[PDB]
RNA sequence: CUUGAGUGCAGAAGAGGAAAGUGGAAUUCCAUGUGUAGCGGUGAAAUGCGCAGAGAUAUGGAGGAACACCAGUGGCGAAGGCGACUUUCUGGUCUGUAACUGACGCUGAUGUGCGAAAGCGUGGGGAUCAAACAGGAUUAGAUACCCUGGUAGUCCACGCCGUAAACGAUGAGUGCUAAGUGUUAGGGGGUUUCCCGCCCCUUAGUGCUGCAGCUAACGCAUUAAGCACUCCGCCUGGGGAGUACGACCGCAAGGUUGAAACUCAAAGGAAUUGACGGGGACCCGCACAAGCGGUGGAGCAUGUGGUUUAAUUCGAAGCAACGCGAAGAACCUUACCAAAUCUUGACAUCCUUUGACAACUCUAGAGAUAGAGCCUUCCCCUUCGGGGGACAAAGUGACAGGUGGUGCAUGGUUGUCGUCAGCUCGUGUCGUGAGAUGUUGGGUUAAGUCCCGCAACGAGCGCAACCCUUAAGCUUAGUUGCCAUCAUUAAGUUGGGCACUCUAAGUUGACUGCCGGUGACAAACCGGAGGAAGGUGGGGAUGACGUCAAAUCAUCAUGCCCCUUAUGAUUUGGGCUACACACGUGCUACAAUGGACAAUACAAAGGGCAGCGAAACCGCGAGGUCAAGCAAAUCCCAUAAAGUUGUUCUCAGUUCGGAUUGUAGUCUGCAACUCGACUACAUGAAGCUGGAAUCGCUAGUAAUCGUAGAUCAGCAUGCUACGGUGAAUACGU
C-alpha cells in the first residue's frame, strides 16, 4: 500500500529518469527504453543548447497539475488536491501518453520536440493541463464542501 | 425434575408421534418425536416427551424425563372418587365415576393414560381439542386437584363417617 | 474432490505400500505380476475376509503377508491348504514364492473386516440400522478414539437412495498424523447396489 | 331505615356550546417610488412570468380565510369534536359538607335526536389550497407520481343526506382482588415565624412498568381481556354479497332492512424457523475505484450450434457446456455407413472328443477367409492304460455378447455455491408446542480466532497446526560435481585438493516471542531491536453439515427393461475433418521499442535401451551417410531465445505482414487421394489498433521470450511444468 521506491540512476545522473524508463518498457524491454531516453537526454541538449535537468525538470514543472478533480455521487465531482508521488505520475504518465500523439517516426525527436515544447509551455500535454485546470477550478462552487 | 424413582413396576405406553421439521436453507433437517406416559397402575402415574432425529433415542428421553414428574392419584375402589372436569390450553376434559363393570370408557391417548394408572371402570367424553397433548395436560391437572374423603375431612374439624361419598 | 482418501494422503509419510519390488523401470511386467495376485486372493478374501496383503519382492524370490480374522480358513488344519496355494498359485505366478500368512490383532476392530461384515448383514437382509448401532457400540469397547461408519444406495429395498452415518467419538481427517484404516466394500440383494464408507482412529503413531 | 340516586350549602377548574365584537403577522391583487435581465421550478429539464421594466426592495390600500409561541400522555365533552382574545346567554362535572326527602334505581326493544369530511339545493363570498381539465417532462407508453397554471369546492347562513379504520377495531351499570411510579383540579394534617415552600394521607379522571389470574398466543393487569350479577345488541364455514327482489327514507347520488341458486375444502388468527427487502447497522473480496494489457474489427487453428449427409458416431449445455471426455482420428482407433461374410459365435467357463502346440509357399479373394501341399506332434509323468499346464475340431445345453434404454431407480467418481467460516450433537432450562437457549452481548481477528460478561455446561466436524516445498546458518559426508592453493591442459582434461559452490541426509531457528506504549490489568492493536526470514513469512496439498432430483449406465460395477440367426461378430474402403453462416476459446498481424544481414553472452527443469544420435562427410535445405560415447550428476537431447554490439532500411499496404495457390523436394509409415509433417522457389491476401458491449490482473504478478515432457509408426498455435527480462497504480469504501 506504501510505494516500494525505484533507487536512482546515474544516467544522466537523477531519479525521475528512474521513474521515466519503466513507462515506456513497453513489453519488458528495458534496454531500449534505456537507450532512446539516454539519447534523448543528448539530444534535447545538443538542439537548442541548454542542461537536460533545465529542459526536463522545467517541462515537468510546466505540464505538472497540482489541482484535479474526481467524481462521486447525481454527477458531482469534488476538485481535489494532487499527492506529489500522483503529481509526478501524472507529468510523466500524460507526458509519454501524448508524447506518443505526436506522431514522428524517431525515437527521440518525438521526445526532446515534447518536453523542449512543454518548457516553452506549448504541446498537448499542456493543453492537458489547461483542460483540467479548466473543467476544474471552474466548477469548483458545489464540490468544494466535502473531504 | 421433580423425583423419579425407578423402584416400581413401569409400563412405558406410546401415544404418538409426528415428523417435525426445522428448514435451513438448502434442506429440511426434521426430528421425530414422541410423547410417553408411565405408570405402575398401582397409584401412579406422568407424562414424559423428546424429540430426537431418530424414534427409540426419542422415547427413551422421554420415559427418562417421564419418570421424573408424577402425581399420586387418588384411587378408590379401583375408581376415582368423584367427577370433574380438567381444563388446560382448550384441551377441556370431563370424567365421571361408574356402576363397576363398565371398563373405562373413552379416547386413545386418555384411555392409554388412565389404562396406566389402574383404573378399572370410570366415563369420560373428551372435549373441547383433540390434540393428544392438552388432553393429557386436562387429565392431570384435574387429577392433580382432586381428593379423597381422608384428604379433605382431615381439614374440615369434623371427620368422616357422618359424611362420605 | 469434493473429499478424498486419506491413505492417498498419508501414504508417503505414514504408511508403507501394499507392494514393494525393485524399479529396474519395468514396472509393467511385475506390477500386473502382482495385478493377478490382487485378483486370486478374493477366493481367499471370500471365506478369510482378510484386511490386506502385503508383496515384498527380494531379486529371486516372492515374500507376501495376508491380514486376517481367520487363520484357520488358510492355513488348513496341519497345513493342508497353504501348499495347495503355492500349487494353485505357480502355475500362474510362473515362479516361486514364500507364502508366510500374518494376524492382524484386536483382531476385529480392523475395517475392511468389519465393513465387508456390515455388508454381509446387508446380503441376507438385515435392516440397516442396528449394523451401525452395534458397529459403532462393539467398536467403542474394544478401545478407539473415534469411528465413522456409513452406507449409501437405496434402503430397504426401497425407492430413492439416500444415505446416513452415524458417527462417534472424534475423526480427526484434516490432520496429517492419524493412522487411521479407511476402507470399502459393496453388495447386491436385489435392488442396484450398496456400498460403504467406513473409518476408525485409534491413536497416533509413525511407522519410525 | 340510610349506605344507592337525587336536592342542598361553600367551593375549583375548564379549547364545553350558540350569537356579536376586536387585532397582529402572513399569502395574494393592485397602485406608487427604487433599479436591471432574469425569475420560478427539477434528480436533469422543459411549459409559464418578464424589456408593456418582472422578480427583488420600501410605503401605504383593499380583500377573504386561518389564528406563531403558548401545547404538555394537558384539559373539556356522551360521541363527532373543541385551541387568537372580550362581552351576552348557557349546559354538565369533581371535591368537601351533611342538615335535607327516604329506594325515587339499572338496562332499554319499537320511537325520537345530535352526528367528521365529501355530497346536494337556495342565496352570498371568492386570499390561498386544489378533484376534473390543458401544457410541459419522465416513460416502450403514463389519460400516474414530478412541474406550471387551474374551475367546482373549501368559507358563511337556512335547509337536506345520515355514513367511516366514527378505533382503544374492547357495550352500559354496580361490587371485590398485590404494588411501584409520574401527571391534572381539589381536600385533611405535621414540620415552617408564615408551607408558598417539604413530607404523610385521601377523593375523581389520567399515562407507563409490573403479580395473583386469565388468554391459543401477542398481550390486560384497580382506566381488567381477572373474580361475578343484571339488561341490551350481535355470530354461527368462505365466495356468491352487503349483491338481487320487495319494502322504507331520500330532490339525487345512495342509506337501512336483507336472502337464494350455483360453488370450494378450505377462508382465517397468533407465534417459530428459513429465504427475501429498490428496509437498517458492520466488515470483507480485482467488487468498485487508481492503473496496465486484451476479446469484440482483420486472417488462421480448434470446438459447439446449424446446414448437409449412405454416415457426417454418442454424451455434455447460464456462471457451474463449447482447445471438454478425446494427454495424439491415414488405416488401427471408431461407436457411425456401403459391400462380402459368421452362428456356443469375436470371446469366456462347462461336458464329450482328442492333442503338446505350428510354419512356409501356390490357388482364389479387396481382406475376412478358406481351397492343397507341408508338418504342429503326447513335451512335465507312464510298467503298454493313464495324469497335466496346454492344443484340438466337432457336437454342444447351461451359454456368450450387446458403445442396447433409464444418471429421475443405484454404487463408485467429479464439479459448483466456497477454503466461503460456519454447521451440528449430548446434559440441563424455558415454552402447551413448533422452536429457542449454547452459537447471544462488549471488545477482538483474515478465521464460530480468542478473552470478558451471560441459564447455560461440554463434545464433535470445520479454520489454524499437523505434512511437502521455499528463505539463512551448523554437522555429516566428496564422484560423474567444483578448481580456491599450485603444476599441466583445447578444456578440470588429470596430479592434487573438498576450502567454496553443490548434491541429499540430520538438526538450529520465527513462537506475541524480546522491549516500549495503548487496551477491562486481559485478549488483542501499534511501534522499536535482532535476525536471512515477524503477526497463517510466500506457495502447495488439503474442500464442514449439505445444495444444484447438477454430470457419468459410454472407464468400471449394476437393479430393472430390451436384442438374439442379430441392438451380437470379422474384414476392405469410408467418416468422425462437410460448409451460405454465427458463437467461444487461442495464434500471428496491422512495423521504427520496427523489419532484414553479421558477430556475441547469461539458464532452469526434464527424457534416452532397442532409445538418445557426438564427431566428420554430402546437400541451399529439411535431411542423408557413418559410427564413437551412452541404462546415466559421466554421454546425447541441447544453439537456449529475448538481449547486447554492428550495417542497412527512413514510412509505403512498404525488405510491413505471411494467408492461398502451383512447382520441386525430406522423413515416418505398406499407401500420405479424401486427411500427415516438413524444406526450397515463386505468389505477396485481409489488415495501418478496433465500434456497441467486454474479460484478465495487486509484484517476481501482468506484459513478454524461448526450453523440456506426456499422449506418440508419423502429428500439439493446444496441456502440464521450466526458467529468462520485468514493471504503473492501490486517493479511498
Ligand atoms: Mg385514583
Known sequence: ?147 | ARREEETKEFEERVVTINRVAKVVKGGRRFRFTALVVVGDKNGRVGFGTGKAQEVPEAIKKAVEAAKKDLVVVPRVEGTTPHTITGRYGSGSVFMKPAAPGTGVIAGGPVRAVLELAGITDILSKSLGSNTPINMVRATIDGLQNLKNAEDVAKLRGKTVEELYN | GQKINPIGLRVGIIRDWEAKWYAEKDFASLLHEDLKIRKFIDNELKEASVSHVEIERAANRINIAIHTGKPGMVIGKGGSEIEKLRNKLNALTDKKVHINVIEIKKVDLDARLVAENIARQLENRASFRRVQKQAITRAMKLGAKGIKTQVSGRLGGADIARAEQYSEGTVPLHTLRADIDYAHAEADTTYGKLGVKVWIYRGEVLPT
Open chain 1, 1 to 147: 500500500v506504501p510505494k516500494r521506491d525505484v533507487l536512482p540512476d546515474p544516467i544522466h545522473n537523477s531519479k525521475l529518469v528512474t521513474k521515466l524508463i519503466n513507462k515506456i518498457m513497453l513489453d519488458g524491454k528495458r534496454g531500449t527504453a534505456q537507450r532512446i531516453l539516454y539519447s534523448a537526454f543528448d539530444l534535447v541538449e545538443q538542439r537548442s543548447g541548454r542542461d537536460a535537468l533545465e529542459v526536463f525538470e522545467e517541462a515537468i514543472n510546466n505540464i505538472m497539475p497540482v489541482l484535479e478533480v474526481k467524481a462521486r455521487r447525481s454527477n458531482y465531482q469534488v476538485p481535489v488536491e494532487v499527492r506529489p508521488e500522483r503529481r509526478t505520475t501524472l507529468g510523466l504518465r500524460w507526458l509519454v501518453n501524448y508524447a506518443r500523439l505526436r506522431g514522428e517516426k524517431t525515437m527521440e525527436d518525438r521526445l526532446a520536440n515534447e518536453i523542449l515544447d512543454a518548457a516553452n509551455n506549448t504541446g498537448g500535454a499542456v493543453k492537458k493541463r489547461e483542460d483540467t485546470h479548466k473543467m476544474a477550478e471552474a466548477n469548483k462552487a458545489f464540490a468544494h464542501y466535502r473531504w
